[PDB]
Design a binder for this molecule. Structure first.
Ligand code: 5RP
Ligand code: 5RP
Ligand code: MG
Ligand code: MG
Lengths: 215, 213
């Protein structure tokens, strides 16, 4: 199978986000309401984007740290398909978000930005979490942290634990070959699509490269 | 004396105002809870500071990454303080703190969930002066109580030089557990908002803090 492409809408306002979606909504598989757009506009962003693009998967990247049931329910009532819970959260937070998700036929991903352990990863699997976002912090990226050997190893180990792994964090087109041969579920691109001279062509380039690399 | 922070974990502004119109003048710090940040977005911060410009307004964003952008959105909305979640890369706390400094605001590391003493030393070396020792609401709902290990950890954080806020389902009866520790702030959300008398609930917290400290 080919890795899917997720666009991150890390825009501060809905009209900024629409400037991207009007160009690339049909060029990508998943539309992410980024954490920045969740904070800028609140959960209406989820409701509105799903109303515009009801045939697409809409992910609310809320990076829930606690109050798993309440915050997941807000996102799902706004018609989210998927929500994110941050890796450090108490296990009951992921569990709570998962129970709500099942009411709505949605799903939960654990976002792996920052500091987590393999013991925690086992708890997620035991709790019934099936997706994780292996995620380089943009702030670490800005401080020179590059994709590398240890990432490939960890991504493979997560996959062998039975998770579908999404990869994210300042991904550029030139980074995709690093991941060749690994059954990546989804690649997320925010800035490398939204900020391109032609977002459409940026998205199509990611799709072509993926098709070549995983074909 | 430890200050009293009310958490506005409400889905909509009008729900938050049901609380604030009762207790805004009864507390020291008004928190835009994470639930309100997600429900309404940063407008919540801008609106509540406009209403209560004399009170400290905390945006409980629990930032996980993009420290500079997300803190700047909160501080442009006139937040005084913002939270960063404990698992965030150290450069996220640093980014948020650099922005905070431009606005004469501050950053707290929220300690909900899994973190390490090595990370705590990193926050200190980065110039972080505030943490929120925080029992997860979901852990609370699964039966996790405040205990001596929490008290030991709070004292340890205080000895490292942090001003410590305590939070997580706090009830009036919990206050004596922390006696003798120079707690900076106690947060109460449910035990004030959902009280039969929110005004009595806030006054009782302040009365008890004044007695104990
Ligand atoms: O949650 C996030 C941090 C982003 O949404 C994600 O990393 C994709 O955006 P970018 O490609 O710009 O990093
Ligand atoms: O961030 C939070 C979780 C709450 O805002 C905090 O714990 C205060 O609320 P409560 O007293 O209801 O737990
Ligand atoms: Mg995101
Ligand atoms: Mg809070």
């Amino acid at each position: 199978s080919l890795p899917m492409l997720q666009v991150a809408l890390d825009n501060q306002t809905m009209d900024s986000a629409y400037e991207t979606t009007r160009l690339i909504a049909e060029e990508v598989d998943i539309i992410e309401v980024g954490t920045i757009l969740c904070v800028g506009e609140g959960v209406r962003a989820v409701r509105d984007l799903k109303a515009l693009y009801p045939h697409k998967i809409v992910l609310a990247d809320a990076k829930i740290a606690d109050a798993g049931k309440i915050l997941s329910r807000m996102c799902f009532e706004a018609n989210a398909d998927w929500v994110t819970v941050i890796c450090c959260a108490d296990i009951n937070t992921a569990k709570g978000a998962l129970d709500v998700a099942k009411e709505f036929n949605g799903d939960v991903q654990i976002d792996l930005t920052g500091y987590w352990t393999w013991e925690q990863a086992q708890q997620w699997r035991d709790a019934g979490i099936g997706q994780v976002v292996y995620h380089r912090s943009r702030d670490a990226q800005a401080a020179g942290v590059a994709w590398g050997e240890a990432d490939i190893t960890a991504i493979k180990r997560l996959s062998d634990m039975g998770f579908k792994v999404t990869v994210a964090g300042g991904l550029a087109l030139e980074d995709l070959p690093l991941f060749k041969g690994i059954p990546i579920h989804v690649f997320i691109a925010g800035r490398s699509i939204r900020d391109a001279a032609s977002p459409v062509e940026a998205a199509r380039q990611f799709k072509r490269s993926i098709a070549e690399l995983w074909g």
